[PDB]
């Protein structure tokens with residue numbers, strides 16, 4: 001049927017990016033790799049400066065909105081690809097959007113507020129969250145990272161309790177690259193061999 | 205007490221900018237004038253390209269979120285100004301954001317979706333909508349302006365029916381510059397004479 005939207009989520013330095021690349025290479029020639037934030041766009045370059053230069057000042061709400069816009073500027077391309085039968089592997093998406101922003105404890109920016117901008121976006125057919133039991137970018141400090149992880153856990157916990165079965169949390173503690181690759185492949189293979197009709201999609 | 209947040213909304217070319225300028229000129233030396241979109245910022249600049257050039261492609265949802273972000277990157281300064289006693293005259297704000305986007309009739313982009321990103325933003329102490337019974341920028345097409353008009357009315361009617369008494373629709377059809385100014389002042393002046401507690405603020 002139509003291609004699958006596979007998302008791999010997780011904290012900065014958990015092997016997420018390495019695993020997306022591996023999966024991507026494995027699903028060739030019919031697979032695309034998408035990273036968020038997509039820094040090559042005009043909006044993305046703004047997010048880059050924000051991430052890499054602590055001096056670039058931008059309120060939490062604003063940067064948050066830029067991250068959402070960055071997905072919205074690409075979602076049409078994503079859908080077109082899936083419909084044309086192409087699998088897509090995403091390195092970060094809505095869940096990072098909500099978790100990293102909500103972890104800051106800024107007045108008004110709760111899970112609910114953080115999610116709204118992304119409401120309407122395609123939801124992945126499969127989301128894997130890599131969990132482990134630098135300092136180059138803004139959000140890279142041990143204390144914030146611990147904060148984002150509890151937030152990710154809290155958010156994914158709600159979605160799962162709310163009946164979302166497409167979310168699988170994967171513990172990568174003391175697991176090497178190819179061991180993680182095998183666990184992932186275990187969850188991923190079954191969905192790739194599931195037929196999804198072209199008019200069938202889920203949205204946030 | 206604190207300064208007042210006075211907002212002038214309306215369609216393109218309905219006298220809005222002239223009145224804002226007039227009011228700002230008369231509230232001196234204690235008044236700031238703020239325009240949205242505020243095109244001087246990095247985000248403001250992307251908005252400017254979108255508005256002045258068709259080549260610039262950006263999904264309706266993405267441009268919408270930038271508009272919102274543009275307000276959020278400036279809102280902390282607006283609050284600082286008001287707390288410091290200065291009055292603020294605004295030329296467009298949250299109401300334009302919702303109406304112009306919701307007027308597109310894009311799927312999932314209804315009044316509610318369009319409002320979410322702005323939730324939390326300080327609501328003005330007084331919002332005047334200049335109503336009437338070019339083509340150099342993107343939304344300046346008679347047929348689109350017509351849709352935006354109807355959307356603006358449905359939007360303001362809802363906020364009014366909810367009990368927001370700070371919204372005033374001023375009909376300026378065939379009225380001159382000095383007449384509109386007098387009508388605006390009749391509504392504005394009572395509000396400027398009202399003492400507002402440093403801590404009291406309303407929000408979207």
Ligand SMILES: Cc1cn([C@H]2C[C@H](O)[C@@H](COP(=O)(O)O)O2)c(=O)[nH]c1=O
Nearest residue numbers: 012036037067092093096097100101139
């Ligand atoms: C996709 C996305 C990323 N992030 C953060 C996660 C990272 O700390 C930062 C850079 O991510 P990266 O290392 O995957 O490029 O972006 C958000 O805060 N919001 C989002 O919506």
Ligand SMILES: Cc1cn([C@H]2C[C@H](O)[C@@H](COP(=O)(O)O)O2)c(=O)[nH]c1=O
Nearest residue numbers: 216240241271296297300301304305343
């Ligand atoms: C502030 C704002 C304006 N607009 C549109 C209305 C105007 O047609 C366009 C440019 O405004 P301007 O002529 O007042 O500078 O911006 C939105 O679409 N949403 C917003 O958030």
